[PDB]
Amino acid sequence: GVFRRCCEKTMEVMRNSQETLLTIVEVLLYDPLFDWTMNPLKALYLQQRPEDETELDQSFNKVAERVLMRLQEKLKGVEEGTVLSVGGQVNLLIQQAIDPKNLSRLFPGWKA
Amino acid sequence: GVFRRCCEKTMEVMRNSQETLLTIVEVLLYDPLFDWTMNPLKALYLQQRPEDETELDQSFNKVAERVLMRLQEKLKGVEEGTVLSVGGQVNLLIQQAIDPKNLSRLFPGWKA
């Protein structure tokens, strides 16, 4: 009714200004104090607590360019190579949400 | 008059069958007798003759995947990241032909 229409309405507000929203990530990722890369401790310190409850460098620039290309291909396109305009992209997004086959592969602490 | 309209008419015949024309390159590039990669001798044996007239491996698979992505992005898209549908793609193609600034950077034996 309203969710998908609002999504397809708010998804085209950045397609007319594609050359603007991507300029923030490129200037926030070239900072020296960046901590967005996966560290051996930062990727486990926030996930060992549910495990305990259950059991009672040029590589950085490479990953930066990779995620930049990923966020560039996320909008106005898809990883399948097709166009997938606002008429189908929001449907793909909302179908990747309500899917029990994928929800069974999620983290147990995600949803009770 | 006729050239650009014929180009924009013949360029959309493969956009409806994008999943077909790319299947020939992938099956003709995985042959053992391939000789499309730039060899130190094959890239100069066909160019040393004009010079004489003037003077009176995983890398192969990597380049194959690279040129595959290049030919995948050539149609229904452009390297600039924009869409560039048939209405502008043929105009961008014919603009790289009639351009003296670029023709001055061409090979002398290309055009007399």
Curated annotation (Swiss-Prot), chains A, B:
Motif (Microbody targeting signal): 104-106
Domain FATC: 82-112
Modified residues (N6-acetyllysine): 74
Modifications the protein undergoes after translation, according to the UniProt entry: Phosphorylated by NUAK1/ARK5. During the late stages of DNA damage response, dephosphorylated following deacetylation by SIRT7, leading to ATM deactivation. Acetylated in vitro by KAT5/TIP60. Deacetylated by SIRT7 during the late stages of DNA damage response, promoting ATM dephosphorylation and subsequent deactivation.
Summary of the tissues where the protein is detected: Found in pancreas, kidney, skeletal muscle, liver, lung, placenta, brain, heart, spleen, thymus, testis, ovary, small intestine, colon and leukocytes.
Localisation per UniProt entry: Nucleus; Cytoplasmic vesicle; Cytoplasm, Cytoskeleton, Microtubule organizing center, Centrosome; Peroxisome matrix
Effect of residue 61 to D: In AT; decreased protein abundance
Induction: By ionizing radiation.
Taxonomy, superkingdom: Eukaryota
Signal peptide range in chain numbering: none
Quaternary data: Homodimer. Dimers or tetramers in inactive state. On DNA damage, autophosphorylation dissociates ATM into monomers rendering them catalytically active. Binds p53/TP53, ABL1, BRCA1 and TERF1. Interacts with NBN (via FxF/Y motif). Part of the BRCA1-associated genome surveillance complex (BASC), which contains BRCA1, MSH2, MSH6, MLH1, ATM, BLM, PMS2 and the RAD50-MRE11-NBN protein complex. This association could be a dynamic process changing throughout the cell cycle and within subnuclear domains. Interacts with RAD17; DNA damage promotes the association.
Function: Serine/threonine protein kinase which activates checkpoint signaling upon double strand breaks (DSBs), apoptosis and genotoxic stresses such as ionizing ultraviolet A light (UVA), thereby acting as a DNA damage sensor. Recognizes the substrate consensus sequence [ST]-Q. Phosphorylates 'Ser-139' of histone variant H2AX at double strand breaks (DSBs), thereby regulating DNA damage response mechanism.
UniProt note: domains: The FATC domain is required for interaction with KAT5.
Illness the protein is tied to: Ataxia telangiectasia: A rare recessive disorder characterized by progressive cerebellar ataxia, dilation of the blood vessels in the conjunctiva and eyeballs, immunodeficiency, growth retardation and sexual immaturity. Patients have a strong predisposition to cancer; about 30% of patients develop tumors, particularly lymphomas and leukemias. Cells from affected individuals are highly sensitive to damage by ionizing radiation and resistant to inhibition of DNA synthesis following irradiation. Defects in ATM may contribute to T-cell acute lymphoblastic leukemia (TALL) and T-prolymphocytic leukemia (TPLL). TPLL is characterized by a high white blood cell count, with a predominance of prolymphocytes, marked splenomegaly, lymphadenopathy, skin lesions and serous effusion. The clinical course is highly aggressive, with poor response to chemotherapy and short survival time. TPLL occurs both in adults as a sporadic disease and in younger AT patients.
UniProt family annotation: Belongs to the PI3/PI4-kinase family. ATM subfamily.
Name of the featured protein: Serine-protein kinase ATM
Organism ancestry: Eukaryota, Metazoa, Chordata, Craniata, Vertebrata
Full protein stretch here: 2925 to 3054 of 3056
